[PDB]
Design an enzyme around this catalytic site. Structure first.
Site, PDB file in Angstrom:
ATOM      1  N   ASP A 166       2.562  10.702  -0.391  1.00 43.98           N
ATOM      2  CA  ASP A 166       1.823  10.485  -1.651  1.00 43.98           C
ATOM      3  C   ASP A 166       2.834   9.902  -2.637  1.00 43.98           C
ATOM      4  O   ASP A 166       4.023   9.856  -2.311  1.00 43.98           O
ATOM      5  CB  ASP A 166       1.128  11.731  -2.166  1.00 43.98           C
ATOM      6  CG  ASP A 166       0.077  11.511  -3.243  1.00 43.98           C
ATOM      7  OD1 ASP A 166      -0.596  12.502  -3.623  1.00 43.98           O
ATOM      8  OD2 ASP A 166      -0.139  10.388  -3.765  1.00 43.98           O
ATOM      9  N   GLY A 203      -9.020  11.406  -7.513  1.00 41.68           N
ATOM     10  CA  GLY A 203      -9.673  12.089  -8.620  1.00 41.68           C
ATOM     11  C   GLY A 203     -10.790  13.049  -8.267  1.00 41.68           C
ATOM     12  O   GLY A 203     -11.587  13.388  -9.159  1.00 41.68           O
ATOM     13  N   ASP A 255      -6.357  15.179   4.215  1.00 42.19           N
ATOM     14  CA  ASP A 255      -5.222  16.087   4.147  1.00 42.19           C
ATOM     15  C   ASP A 255      -5.608  17.355   3.392  1.00 42.19           C
ATOM     16  O   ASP A 255      -6.423  17.314   2.459  1.00 42.19           O
ATOM     17  CB  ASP A 255      -4.036  15.404   3.461  1.00 42.19           C
ATOM     18  CG  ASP A 255      -4.104  15.423   1.951  1.00 42.19           C
ATOM     19  OD1 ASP A 255      -4.616  14.460   1.339  1.00 42.19           O
ATOM     20  OD2 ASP A 255      -3.642  16.422   1.355  1.00 42.19           O
ATOM     21  N   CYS A 260     -11.825  28.418  20.560  1.00 37.12           N
ATOM     22  CA  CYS A 260     -10.609  27.694  20.259  1.00 37.12           C
ATOM     23  C   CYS A 260      -9.680  27.674  21.475  1.00 37.12           C
ATOM     24  O   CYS A 260      -9.463  28.690  22.133  1.00 37.12           O
ATOM     25  CB  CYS A 260      -9.921  28.311  19.043  1.00 37.12           C
ATOM     26  SG  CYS A 260      -8.393  27.443  18.617  1.00 37.12           S
ATOM     27  N   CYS A 275      -6.517  26.651  21.257  1.00 34.98           N
ATOM     28  CA  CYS A 275      -5.092  26.608  20.889  1.00 34.98           C
ATOM     29  C   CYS A 275      -4.265  27.695  21.567  1.00 34.98           C
ATOM     30  O   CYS A 275      -4.756  28.724  22.025  1.00 34.98           O
ATOM     31  CB  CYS A 275      -4.987  26.694  19.363  1.00 34.98           C
ATOM     32  SG  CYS A 275      -4.780  28.372  18.698  1.00 34.98           S
ATOM     33  N   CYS A 298      -4.766  31.345  20.503  1.00 37.84           N
ATOM     34  CA  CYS A 298      -5.983  32.034  20.942  1.00 37.84           C
ATOM     35  C   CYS A 298      -5.940  32.314  22.434  1.00 37.84           C
ATOM     36  O   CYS A 298      -6.688  33.141  22.933  1.00 37.84           O
ATOM     37  CB  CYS A 298      -7.207  31.200  20.568  1.00 37.84           C
ATOM     38  SG  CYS A 298      -7.482  31.271  18.773  1.00 37.84           S
ATOM     39  N   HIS A 336      -2.867  28.080  14.752  1.00 33.55           N
ATOM     40  CA  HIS A 336      -4.302  28.187  14.994  1.00 33.55           C
ATOM     41  C   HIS A 336      -5.120  27.322  14.042  1.00 33.55           C
ATOM     42  O   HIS A 336      -5.993  26.571  14.474  1.00 33.55           O
ATOM     43  CB  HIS A 336      -4.773  29.651  14.846  1.00 33.55           C
ATOM     44  CG  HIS A 336      -6.275  29.683  14.717  1.00 33.55           C
ATOM     45  ND1 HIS A 336      -7.065  29.455  15.821  1.00 33.55           N
ATOM     46  CD2 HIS A 336      -7.111  29.903  13.669  1.00 33.55           C
ATOM     47  CE1 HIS A 336      -8.335  29.532  15.442  1.00 33.55           C
ATOM     48  NE2 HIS A 336      -8.396  29.797  14.141  1.00 33.55           N
TER      49      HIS A 336
END
Ligand SMILES: CNc1nc2cc3c(=O)[nH]c(N)nc3c(CCO)c2[nH]1
Ligand SMILES: CNc1nc2cc3c(=O)[nH]c(N)nc3c(CCO)c2[nH]1
Ligand SMILES: [Zn+2]
Ligand SMILES: [Zn+2]
Lengths: 349, 349
Positions: free
Chosen positions: B92, B203, B253, B285, B287, B290, B316
């Site tokens: 940014d 904004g 993001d 999940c 991942c 998990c 996770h």
């Protein structure tokens, strides 16, 4: 695998190298046991702890007894399942961290300590002892030592009375006696009479300094049964480990590995001289941290209070200790440990 | 690979799915960009960030400018090398986090913002803007919008004047205009006239609430060039992402993924009802967290303030977001996204 088998493959002076075979795995000795306080080795997944080369970790009973509770962990499947470490775990008995009557401590008895470790599913159970303050008067050392031996018998009996525990786990007794030779001898004989799977040297690393710790080890470790593991509780710095192995110690634990260990001695990564150093933490270290990140990065992370900084510092430090233990094991195996100890020290200091 | 190529593989209503090709890798869109504040994605190694499925991360310029300094990171080899992420990075421009004159902000100018991002080695550079407070009067919205467009031209010129930057990196412009349609239209036309690689909607997510954010997206996103990526800065919650994709947004993001996302809605793992729950965080999940640990364990860890708790919760949550993005991509590809959005919401709420 057996419940417990210690075999000595090689020796040099008082130093030894070999293996402890247990149902959940083999432990290479001399061994360093990373400390998992609150059912976690700080900032590391178990798979990471194992990749550093640890064969066994130490579980901190005092904290677990307070949270989440030993009963809860048992309901949940035991510490191994809970935290995701399936290799051997050694549990301390809780006394030490709690710090009073003959029955135990209010704030824990030999019986409740043994039961809690069973509920946690520990592989190597520590007898419940009374650590003796340093310094100690001979009378006070004696009284404390005596109580501990009484408590070691109670521990033995509580362990043996629990069939699943006696058949699957091992029990270590703890020598006490402060810095007094006669007291250490009475403590060793009393524990040998009871009979244990291994023998810890307790009451050291409690402010006496390396010279006095080594002096006491010099006469204390030969009092213990030769054919069983010798554990020095709470030690310690790399220099301390090397000298303790030279005096017959087989097992170690230490808490706190910005301080980073290197073969050139410790560094503090917070030091501004590292803000632009692109070298890894240590020039020889084989760990993943030293493969991938620089001093400058870890320096930034630690000063920033970032969690990745602690993750990376701890992986390195525990990997460094494991590599130290491996070099001690290999040098004893090859009968060049005394030379390794001298070379290490010259460089480290 | 090219410097920059966005291709749209499939569409459904306003939603799109496709790829952004960049020298350091390919970005699957709609994309979620984990946020790395202070040159680290909180509590995760880059290899872990990548294993969750992230294609790109966001670098937080404001913090990096203050520490370690953009000049230092350049000397050290650039952000990618510094933190060990070799895939695309979006930076940014710093204005937003800093929060005043036409030349910039004292506390940063369009020119210095672009230079800092270059020093960091950013792949996708954000123009330097003035975010407009919410709520805003039409006059104040207009003035701010106007300044930003002036600043977008200065950004463009600074970027283009730096040959290595222009040839290897991409520049995104940022639409402003508060919640006012006419102001958003002037902002979109002004940025299209300058010409950018992609267009952010700035904004929003500044306290207006989901209904008003969606209302503004409804007219604002169609004002932007269709053939370039549309980035909604700072969003957001899973429900927000789904609705934003339905309105033509391609990139996201968000900071903060004891809150754990599940397909049944968020949970707070600190809740005592999880102290003995052996189920994983989410039942579907995929991942690693998990696969391996329970709610009960992570519950204990978070309540204990243990670092492993944050590591596990964040892996996770970022894995969950990536799986969400994958299901959005796949459903658009198969022309069933509107059905996916309805099913998701029924269940999530
Ligand atoms: C840090 N030095 C140290 N000395 C110790 C001494 C003792 C002791 O004498 N008995 C028991 N049970 N634990 C001990 C512990 C905790 C080891 O992590 C010690 N830790
Ligand atoms: C959390 N909501 C949010 N609204 C934003 C709005 C803006 C904006 O308008 N301009 C710039 N440069 N950044 C923005 C950021 C930071 C995105 O991480 C925002 N973040
Ligand atoms: Zn290392
Ligand atoms: Zn998960």
């Amino acid at each position: 695998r057996p419940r417990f088998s210690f075999s000595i493959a090689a020796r040099e002076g008082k130093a030894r190298t070999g293996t402890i075979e247990m149902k959940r795995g083999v432990i290479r000795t001399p061994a360093f046991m990373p400390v998992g306080t609150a059912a976690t080795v700080k900032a590391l997944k178990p798979e990471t702890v194992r990749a550093t080369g640890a064969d066994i970790i130490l579980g901190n009973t005092y904290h677990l007894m307070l949270r989440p509770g030993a009963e809860r962990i048992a309901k949940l499947g035991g510490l191994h399942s809970f935290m995701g470490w399936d290799r051997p775990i050694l549990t301390d008995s809780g006394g030490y961290q709690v710090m009073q009557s003959e029955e135990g401590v209010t704030f824990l008895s030999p019986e409740r300590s043994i039961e809690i470790q069973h509920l946690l599913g520990s592989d190597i159970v520590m007898a419940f002892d009374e650590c003796t303050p340093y310094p100690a008067t001979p009378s006070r050392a004696a009284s404390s030592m005596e109580r501990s031996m009484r408590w070691a018998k109670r521990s033995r009996d509580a362990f043996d009375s629990r069939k699943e525990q006696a058949e699957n786990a091992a029990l270590f007794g703890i020598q006490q006696g402060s810095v007094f030779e006669n007291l250490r001898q009475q403590s060793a004989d009393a524990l040998a009479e009871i009979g244990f799977d291994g023998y810890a040297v307790g009451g050291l690393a409690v402010g006496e300094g390396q010279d006095e710790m080594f002096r006491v080890l010099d006469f204390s470790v030969p009092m213990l049964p030769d054919d069983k593991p010798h554990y020095l509780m709470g030690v310690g710095k790399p220099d301390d480990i090397v000298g303790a192995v030279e005096r017959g110690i087989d097992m170690f634990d230490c808490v706190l590995p910005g301080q980073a260990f290197t073969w050139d001695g410790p560094i503090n990564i917070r030091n501004a001289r590292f803000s632009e150093d692109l070298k890894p933490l240590d020039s020889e270290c084989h760990c993943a941290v030293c493969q991938k990140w620089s001093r400058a990065y870890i320096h930034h992370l630690i000063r920033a209070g970032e969690i990745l900084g602690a993750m990376l510092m701890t992986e390195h430090n525990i990997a460094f200790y494991q590599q130290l233990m491996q070099k001690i094991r290999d040098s004893i195996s090859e009968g060049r440990f005394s030379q390794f100890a001298q070379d290490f020290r010259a460089r480290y200091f």
